[model samples]
Target: ETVPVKLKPGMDGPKVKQWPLTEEKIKALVEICTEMEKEGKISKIGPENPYNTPVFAIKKKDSTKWRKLVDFRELNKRTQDFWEVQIPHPAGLKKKKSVTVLDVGDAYFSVPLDEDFRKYTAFTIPSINNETPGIRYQYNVLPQGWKGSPAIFQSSMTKILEPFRKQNPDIVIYQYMDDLYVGSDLEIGQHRTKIEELRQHLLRWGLTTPDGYELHPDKWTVQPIVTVNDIQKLVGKLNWASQIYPGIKVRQLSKLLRGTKALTEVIPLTEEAELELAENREILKHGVYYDPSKDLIAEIQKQGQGQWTYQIYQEPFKNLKTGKYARMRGAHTNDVKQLTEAVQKITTESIVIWGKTPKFKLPIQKETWETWWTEYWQATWIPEWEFVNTPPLVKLWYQLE
Candidate 1:
């Protein structure tokens, strides 16, 4: 409250602009200003203030009631500006316990004004239904749109909460301007204690909560998307969120769909899967960064391993009675002799007894051996009789009728 501010030397005040309003808007504006008067935010002043700016009534989307906004661009250009600490929008609020929203009502007005800064802050509100003449009003405290409001308010807010914030590590505080969040990671119901304490701390110096509002039930909650369909549905909406922050790059639904054959399958809240959502949510939390010049992935990829052959790799034929089908077409008998010798030695190394999936390493596996038999001979070749006795000579006699 004691911090005195200085303004640029030559700039006297703002150029006043006229903004006409409807009867409904005038009534709304009077109602709003009347409330501000009661709140000690503004005070009645003589009509001849040196400085003034256009304050207009505009309705926020989806709301029937109108709100007041002031144009201070002209005023801001002259404020001899200025360390207000940087307001941080931290992505991860350490949702370790509870990130409680305890926003201060009439946030900017919580900081008091000094002397006739009011003379500089003067403005007019039109008469209600034209029964009375337009009346002049000036803010008795920091109001929105003033260049000094953010830095001054931010500084005072930090200094004001310095004691409570520093001492309580278990229950911490986070604030961006007047928006405050109480963080209590250690225990349940501790946040309630912190919130009450914070409310008391704020009340000691001008900050307040709306009387009817007692921390709505929905205010403190975290809704987690628990299904694959939900993930896609969420990502679908997040695609809409991308319109808000184009820098965001999301790739979860594909990466997470590793084992899920069907979309309906309830995704396990696995470590990696949850992170995809959390990670993207954090990215969206910060939104887009406008300022320029700012700024192992082991995939356990297991594809079907053994079928490495490409499309052109045709299987060896099942049967080949003629020498034309043999590997060496011209040297047919010699090729057969050579193949038999190689197989014999391989069999000697490890007698791979025929069964489903042979144990020992071989040139080929079980099912393909039958392909060789059918390929070379007109009828099925019996391996039992041929390899039963290890004849150290030209094995497995060959004949044709």
Candidate 2:
């Protein structure tokens, strides 16, 4: 159950402002609000020093169904900020062969809002079915976008874990938001005890396992790209999977999705593009392979404002049957000009490494002649012409005898 939120002294809540809504969505929003009110999760309240928020609906991916969300920008701004506790890093867990990852589903909803703070979360919804029109309702449960929700929840979790920490000081615990990671590097029994203790603590707090958390093969499996939606979903899933799965080359796989712009367009793959797709799939099938000493694939991502970062991965090249553990470097860039500078630097060092060039199909850095580099020279010493309008933005071959 949620307790009352404590606000700083002399802090008055903000008033709710009017927001735009469509006829159909307004009715839908009203229905949900009415249901919440009936379920005692929310209540109709009078406007008293009212701090109001707005609600908006977003369509789910590849579906007509919509998810409603409250815009808490105003409320978040007025509320006092808390010093957030640092979450422990999970890098240490990799040392243990066995590790348990637990998730507290809809974690914010589990904590009740402080009675005093509920008024700040109040918002108005249009009436449906001849009910009260433009009714103002306030949340009784802890809502998701509240600025203090994380700190509040963190405080509660700290209370729950305090006893366990005192009893068992061996097992390492790492928490990021609602997900908890715990394991013992030495003993398996200690790891199991740590998991049990966490579950018991959650049970005491009335937390239960969430539904629809299990994998559904039918929903996850991709079908043939017959329609525009299929291609979009495929690319989105591939993008998400690339982050979690270590072996997959996201840039190479993205080449397949880049050609198809519109939903109605049917773009056929070329021989090389088809090979890339197949190679990626094969890599996924074999799963993650790591050779720490082989080579580091340096992925340079372009952040905004001319800032960039390099991320290292162990031997991202999956299907290569070439030289063994050659001290090489591979760099992928978001911008062609960025890649050009990086290529020049790497080749200048005369350090041989396997690197995938940025996809030439992508747009150049800027809309200028110099930036486009219609026919840029390969390197200062190398007498080769770098094709600006083709794949292999940088070549994939060795130099000298």
Candidate 3:
């Protein structure tokens, strides 16, 4: 047995990598499975001809992000009536390269088993009066809540697919929510073998596919060549994938995720897939700064840098306006630097909608600052509609009697 380690030396450094599994999560799942096994809930053996027997994936709240298990009985009951969203597949109308099979792992019920009952005892809310026929309780279902659900499920499914996957190892089988996708291959025979193996396992589990829960026999469609629009949609779902793809100029996915305004035609992401959304944020920011003014933003738009966007930031002020300290300001600012920085950042990020940025190397056109300002304003008074739709502009509002 290992000696107890000192907390200071052993645990005080930044971690080098992310951990997919933790001990506490594992123990919780083990308890659940053990309880079920004790109750004789799991069948001793799986069925024969798993391929032909109906099967469906059961989405459960497992501990692992990647590994998942199926809940056939529950799928049957809840998925009684539903329809698959018919998005056009990339491959068009044709015979499927091979029959697509969705292989699901074992099923876990919503209710926990006996052993799990003990570890999760603190969660138990028994009858207050002690006279009720049943005991009521609440259970933790999120990650780190239900213990071993992830590892057990991952191990089981991985083991189940091993034999078949070994044959044609190139097939990508993404497992999430007990759903398994055996992607098509050039070799039809190889694909067939993979599906058959997974089907056999499901048959053994006494599970059958539920209605509308299946891969179409027709040739599978490849998602269309994603556009800047596609990047936005993809980030909305799994922003992590944006890392693989390029030109997703959105800032932290969290920014877009917070609200429900579709930015399909407002941002500038490109065809490259490897670009992360974080990177796109920089590209857009720098591009704006490269030529800080209303004309530059429009020029970038014309070049198809991205979609049309109306929001624009303002320039930094020479001094703080209100006597009230920045710290006293509400949610927008909580510190002096923060308040000043906000204005500075916006000014640097945006440009005057109607004016051109001054070139650092070029001499000022007019002799004095006031003269230049008057000349620029008098030179052009853009239509009101254009001003509102262009970007940000400096203006004042007053009520005259």
Tell me the TM-score of model 1: 0.42
lDDT of 2 by residue, 144-175 (tens): 55656656788777777788777778665655
Q: Would you list the clashing residue pairs of candidate 2?
A: 2-112, 4-114, 4-115, 5-114, 14-51, 16-52, 328-353, 329-353, 330-355
Ten contiguous residues minimizing lDDT sum, candidate 3? 378-387
Measured by TM-score, how close is model 2 to the native structure? 0.39
lDDT, candidates in the order shown: 0.52, 0.52, 0.32
- Tens digits of per-residue lDDT, candidate 1, 1-401, equal 44687668966877585455568768878899999999898989974676677776654324465657665656666676653444344334543455555545356776687674667777888886667878888888887666577667776677778888777766656553334656555454666666777778777877775321122222223333226786677767767667766754456555665564577688766565577667676775422222211210000111232211111001223211101012334554433333433333222211111101111122232433433432232110112212222323344558443
TM-score of each: 0.42, 0.39, 0.25
- Listed per model in order, the count of residue pairs whose N, CA or C atoms clash below 3 Å is 4, 9, 31
Candidate 2, after superposition: displacement of residue 153 in Å? 2.8
Give stretches of model 3 more than 4 Å off. 1-118, 121-133, 137-147, 185-194, 202-212, 215-401
Candidate 1 Cα errors over 4 Å, as ranges = 8-12, 16-18, 22-25, 31-41, 56-74, 84-102, 105-112, 170-174, 181-197, 204-206, 211-401
Q: Is candidate 1 or candidate 3 better by TM-score?
A: 1
